[PDB]
Design an enzyme around this catalytic site. Structure first.
Site, PDB file in Angstrom:
ATOM      1  N   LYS A 255       8.894   0.211  10.795  1.00 49.63           N
ATOM      2  CA  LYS A 255       7.917   1.079  11.449  1.00 49.63           C
ATOM      3  C   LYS A 255       6.499   0.765  10.984  1.00 49.63           C
ATOM      4  CE  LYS A 255       8.973   4.978   8.312  1.00 49.63           C
ATOM      5  NZ  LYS A 255      10.294   4.392   7.950  1.00 49.63           N
TER       6      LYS A 255
ATOM      7  N   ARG B 251      13.819   3.809  -9.924  1.00 48.62           N
ATOM      8  CA  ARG B 251      12.639   3.055  -9.514  1.00 48.62           C
ATOM      9  C   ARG B 251      12.803   1.577  -9.841  1.00 48.62           C
TER      10      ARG B 251
ATOM     11  N   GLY C 226       5.479  -2.088   9.689  1.00 48.64           N
ATOM     12  CA  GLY C 226       5.145  -3.410  10.193  1.00 48.64           C
ATOM     13  C   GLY C 226       4.810  -3.402  11.672  1.00 48.64           C
TER      14      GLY C 226
ATOM     15  N   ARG D 200      -5.640   9.306   1.161  1.00 48.62           N
ATOM     16  CA  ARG D 200      -5.012  10.620   1.186  1.00 48.62           C
ATOM     17  C   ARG D 200      -5.860  11.611   0.409  1.00 48.62           C
ATOM     18  NH1 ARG D 200       1.189   8.126   0.597  1.00 48.62           N
ATOM     19  NH2 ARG D 200       1.539   8.039   2.859  1.00 48.62           N
TER      20      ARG D 200
ATOM     21  N   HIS E 281       0.069   2.803  -8.116  1.00 46.94           N
ATOM     22  CA  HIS E 281       0.473   3.526  -6.914  1.00 46.94           C
ATOM     23  C   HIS E 281       1.658   4.410  -7.278  1.00 46.94           C
ATOM     24  CE1 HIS E 281       1.005   4.555  -2.767  1.00 46.94           C
ATOM     25  NE2 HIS E 281       2.084   3.818  -2.577  1.00 46.94           N
TER      26      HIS E 281
ATOM     27  N   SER F 297       9.654  -5.654  12.077  1.00 44.11           N
ATOM     28  CA  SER F 297      10.720  -4.889  12.710  1.00 44.11           C
ATOM     29  C   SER F 297      10.796  -3.458  12.191  1.00 44.11           C
ATOM     30  CB  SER F 297      12.066  -5.589  12.508  1.00 44.11           C
ATOM     31  OG  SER F 297      12.384  -5.712  11.131  1.00 44.11           O
TER      32      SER F 297
ATOM     33  N   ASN G 232       7.052  -1.494  -1.593  1.00 44.31           N
ATOM     34  CA  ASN G 232       7.020  -0.737  -2.835  1.00 44.31           C
ATOM     35  C   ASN G 232       8.109  -1.208  -3.787  1.00 44.31           C
ATOM     36  OD1 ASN G 232       4.897   1.176  -3.023  1.00 44.31           O
ATOM     37  ND2 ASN G 232       5.862   2.417  -1.419  1.00 44.31           N
TER      38      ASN G 232
ATOM     39  N   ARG H 205      15.138   3.185  -0.504  1.00 45.40           N
ATOM     40  CA  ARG H 205      15.576   3.678  -1.803  1.00 45.40           C
ATOM     41  C   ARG H 205      16.547   4.838  -1.605  1.00 45.40           C
ATOM     42  NH1 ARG H 205      12.302   6.425  -6.937  1.00 45.40           N
ATOM     43  NH2 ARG H 205      14.237   7.158  -7.917  1.00 45.40           N
TER      44      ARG H 205
END
Ligand SMILES: NC(=O)C1=CN([C@@H]2O[C@H](COP(=O)(O)OP(=O)(O)OC[C@H]3O[C@@H](n4cnc5c(N)ncnc54)[C@H](OP(=O)(O)O)[C@@H]3O)[C@@H](O)[C@H]2O)C=CC1
Ligand SMILES: NC(=O)C1=CN([C@@H]2O[C@H](COP(=O)(O)OP(=O)(O)OC[C@H]3O[C@@H](n4cnc5c(N)ncnc54)[C@H](OP(=O)(O)O)[C@@H]3O)[C@@H](O)[C@H]2O)C=CC1
Ligand SMILES: NC(=O)C1=CN([C@@H]2O[C@H](COP(=O)(O)OP(=O)(O)OC[C@H]3O[C@@H](n4cnc5c(N)ncnc54)[C@H](OP(=O)(O)O)[C@@H]3O)[C@@H](O)[C@H]2O)C=CC1
Ligand SMILES: NC(=O)C1=CN([C@@H]2O[C@H](COP(=O)(O)OP(=O)(O)OC[C@H]3O[C@@H](n4cnc5c(N)ncnc54)[C@H](OP(=O)(O)O)[C@@H]3O)[C@@H](O)[C@H]2O)C=CC1
Ligand SMILES: [K+]
Ligand SMILES: [K+]
Ligand SMILES: [K+]
Ligand SMILES: [K+]
Lengths: 312, 312, 312, 312
Positions: C11, C92, C13, C154, C178, C9, C123, C86
């Protein structure tokens, strides 16, 4: 894109014709042969059309003889595979001379018709690329040969099968002559993008035997099935894919040197970026002293033949 | 997927080997030939590996003779192109008898090794599919031949080139015998999904000439270039693509009839769904009066050969 | 292949669902969400179907809530993208804790239903992969996360654009967290297969600025567009492609370490071969002294968070 | 090929930008938005670059505002997805008026810069195509909207799922308005090339219900997930693939009628061949009496709106 193939009646030319006709960007293909072989081309065309019906691709194929060269005009690329079968009673020099006459005639006629890019496959590929360059009077970036590219790919296979990895995981580069003086660049060999020297198992690689296998593979395939067809055709496909979409792929191809690496008046396999406008020699690469010395030896090996066939 | 190819030393089998090795899902390929041709296979394998290095694909290829059939066990599919060259004095029935012995022997040996699918290309393809079915004692959905699929693709070519459209824009289906009694289904011919009979220009289509062209195309290519190569291989590739991902594509392939359309004890080109488990005949399709009559005639024609080679 | 996606549901995914449904080998896709979002998934399904009609692909898509987990049983792969945003007041560790609850609940339920591979995107990806491993009780090679693969890609982009080369021309590997402690491997960076350090122009590369760009790119895309979607989805597609045909591609993914590189009880991005059975850590690669030092630091950083969530 | 996308900040435009950047023939992509949304486009660009790194593709992406229209010059194609969301208080005529202002303004600015093809997605798609044609003063073959193409694809999905077949096995064509007056061409509905009316199971097809589902699919997807993304984007991709390789695919797209089928001064979905130079209406197709009556009714329906917005 529009591609002509002089030599499509042979096995290599026919495999190239099939592979390139299947590419979506190849809208027009021109098959050219000697007059006596026109019928063969007419068969090939039909065969390829049937194949396209199976692959869900499309192409328009024209046929012409190697004198009028009809439909050649306007081609983005002309691939030449025409070459005499080297009989056992011939030297490398004999083959060079005869095929030099053939390649020079075709290059002169093509230059009389139009400006285009020449992709030479006929062996000795470096010497024939040199002949095509001098006789076409084209810009040097517009004339190139398969050269050590095939060698690189064969080397790739060897590496991939020794380490038991997907063939596409391996990349390697070979410079110099498409012959016994070829210079493999171990520094430019990798698996998964990682230099091969960064692997602890690199010590286990029988590198000398592998390189000898690469040097002998052409003769091996000749002895076993009569000569390669799919390998070189797919190498040509790879190069053409770089050209069609202007990818500027860094490959090793034979082209004319006008000062690069300190050499001139010779064609040899070198690092090049391949794009829509042809071949740009990459001098930004640094070689080890051993690799550069082997490369020098290979260039001087090629230059003897080039001198022997320049003015034929 | 694992595929064995009995007859890879021939031109059709070689092209099939190259095309299938290139498919990402074909991870294992077994090339099988008579003993004297093993070296040819050894060349082919190398050639193909080279080609894969150019196409960024990968495969593991094994070689074996046609008596041991080593490595064949475990194959998801076995394609058979082995066949005797038809001399000018041979009739279709003489060819049928010779190749029926060959096909039946291979089918018995394969059935002794394992259970698998059989894809028969050897001609007369309907009769050879029949012989493979009866000698293998495999389930009927597991035994099929190219049949009229190649004819359908060639018909596609003719139509597309007459009307000047992309080849993939045309779809057509031919049923019955892979021969002079084939039944083109104009009621299921289309351009852009549009029934061809809904185009005003359909009246301009020289249908008789085009069908005769399709019926004679194999001989034409034999006379022009020595025989078909890429067309058949690509048609096989299309079928195998339907098999690999269980697409249940609706194609026309030869398979054994056990009541469908009121016929039995015969193999003929019929509409089938092609999936991981084989071919399923589609009886839900309705033919015109004329098309059903023609299909009946064609079935009888095929049975006259099947009866002559059943017990050889 | 069969793939379930928990978090379809969102973006990322949704983009993953679209890309994977288009793959020919992905024959069943299960979309899973919280009950309140089921309608969204329904819409998504319809949308994807329409897209397939355009791409000439196919798939069967089922929908189910995150409690029954209907249709998940039998999945070769389960991708989890479910995560909370977040907020600026979250540390974090706060994010790790809140998302550890989600990941651990889903992992325990999945392991109660069947055994499968888990591909964690949520994450902080290393820590969430660790939680998925401990809560699923699955074999460690069956649990992995995107980890430093996206960073790797990237980095590729940066390099390519600086040198004006085709993006696919560059290969690079990033190991460790990461996060800000990621360790770029210049010893495993290449352009056209040539190590980047063998280009005379390598001295011109602003490596520090580029690495800071890679570290910040996630937040940058959040600030500009509201979060990444296509990048991560395509990275997941690359991984799945290696899994589906058992290519054993050498990538960098996060997975549990049980001794490799002198570390245990932690999940971190490491070189791995990706196959049908999951990830195999590659220890045969030799990093530079500096790179291995930084890798050690990064693993310690990660383990500090793993210790805080192991018991949550 | 060079493509500009005005409206790439929306969801449909963003999905189109991703899909088209991935195409090998698309070397340059220009993303255009209102100045305030420029940052969003920057985000999109970075995201797409990351995705390309995963797909092994490449593209040069530029960004510009919708007033200066920088980088647009030289575009082979300009796709317009800009449009205001229909609030619950607006009728179709209100939406048409607002989006007609938007489309006419863009069409005039584009025509002021250069000649190109215009691909209109903005709804009401037929009316907006009409407005773009009249305000750009381009030749009518250079101006076309997605129109009933999307509808056709949706119909395809329905049919496939009802008969349990691969989606690509189905082809269908819908003409007329992208709306409730659309005219399905049952004659041009097929499975595996077989007209749907030649299946015995056709009697069980809930055809009217399926057509009502197709008519309502846009609103259904809006109500479930907020609007379509991937479906329209993939339909655009299909058209663009026809354009880029000049395949002249026979599709249903909206374009201006100047006498074809007896209608003029209206844009409506009609059978067209789509190639490098735009759309050519296929008048060679013959409709039944009922099909033509439905099409005429749909034309009149469209003409009302077109007359209402022509001068805005
Ligand atoms: N660079 C590389 O790595 C490779 C190079 N090659 C080289 O490519 C060439 C073609 O190989 P291959 O296709 O296997 O060979 P074939 O013998 O199968 O085909 C030879 C081709 O050359 C033509 N030809 C032969 N003699 C003449 C002549 N006197 N004048 C004009 N045309 C002539 C033939 O035409 P016709 O049908 O009328 O005889 C045919 O088109 C060879 O020189 C070969 O060494 C091949 C493989 C790899
Ligand atoms: N169904 C269809 O639409 C099509 C059918 N075909 C059929 O496919 C078959 C192969 O054709 P093609 O590849 O051109 O033929 P080739 O002559 O090029 O190759 C024939 C193959 O059969 C083998 N073979 C020959 N004689 C025997 C024998 N006595 N016993 C066993 N194997 C033998 C050859 O092995 P070796 O090298 O040792 O001689 C070789 O592998 C033919 O029957 C052909 O008619 C072809 C195209 C289309
Ligand atoms: N590894 C990497 O490089 C990347 C990691 N990510 C991570 O992937 C995750 C998804 O990102 P994105 O798709 O942009 O996020 P979105 O906010 O767009 O989607 C979040 C998803 O998580 C679900 N979800 C949210 N809160 C909860 C909850 N409390 N319990 C269960 N499910 C919940 C949503 O379901 P619902 O619709 O019901 O709210 C939805 O499926 C994040 O953790 C993100 O950081 C993303 C990109 C890159
Ligand atoms: N033909 C078909 O089959 C389909 C048609 N469509 C049509 O496509 C269009 C886009 O849909 P979708 O992407 O979902 O919509 P979104 O709301 O997601 O995006 C709207 C886009 O239009 C721009 N825009 C909105 N208002 C204006 C304005 N007044 N002036 C200029 N630009 C404006 C937005 O720019 P900003 O970010 O600055 O607001 C953004 O680029 C709609 O007209 C929709 O009806 C959609 C799907 C299928
Ligand atoms: K083509
Ligand atoms: K393969
Ligand atoms: K799929
Ligand atoms: K591109």
């Amino acid at each position: 894109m529009k591609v002509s193939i002089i030599g499509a009646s042979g096995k290599v030319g026919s495999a190239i014709s099939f592979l390139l006709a299947n590419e979506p960007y190849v809208k027009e293909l021109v098959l050219i042969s000697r007059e006596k072989s026109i019928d063969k081309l007419r068969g090939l065309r039909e065969d390829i059309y049937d194949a396209l019906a199976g692959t869900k691709r499309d192409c328009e194929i024209n046929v012409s003889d190697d004198k009028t060269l009809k439909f050649l005009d306007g081609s983005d690329l002309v691939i030449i595979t025409s070459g005499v079968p080297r009989t056992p009673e011939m030297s490398r020099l004999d083959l060079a001379k005869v095929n030099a006459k053939i390649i020079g005639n075709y290059a002169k006629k093509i230059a009389e018709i139009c400006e285009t890019k020449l992709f030479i496959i006929t062996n000795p590929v470096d010497v024939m690329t040199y002949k095509a360059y001098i006789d076409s009077k084209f810009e040097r970036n517009k004339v190139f040969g398969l050269g050590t590219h095939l060698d690189s790919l064969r080397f790739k296979v060897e590496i991939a099968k020794f380490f038991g990895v997907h063939i596409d995981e391996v990349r390697t580069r070979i410079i110099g002559e498409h012959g016994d003086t070829m210079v493999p660049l171990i520094s430019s060999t990798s698996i998964g993008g990682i230099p091969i020297t960064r692997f602890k198992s690199f010590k286990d690689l029988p590198l000398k035997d592998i390189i000898e296998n690469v040097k002998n593979k052409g003769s091996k395939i000749i002895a076993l099935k009569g000569g390669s067809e799919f390998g070189p055709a797919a190498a040509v496909l790879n190069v053409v894919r770089s050209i069609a979409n202007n990818e500027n792929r860094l490959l090793t191809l034979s082209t004319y040197l006008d000062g690069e690496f300190g050499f001139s008046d010779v064609c040899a396999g070198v690092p090049v970026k391949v794009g829509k406008d042809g071949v740009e020699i990459v001098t930004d690469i640094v070689f080890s002293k051993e690799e550069f010395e082997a490369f020098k030896y290979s260039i001087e090996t090629i230059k003897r033949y080039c001198e022997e066939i320049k003015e034929l």
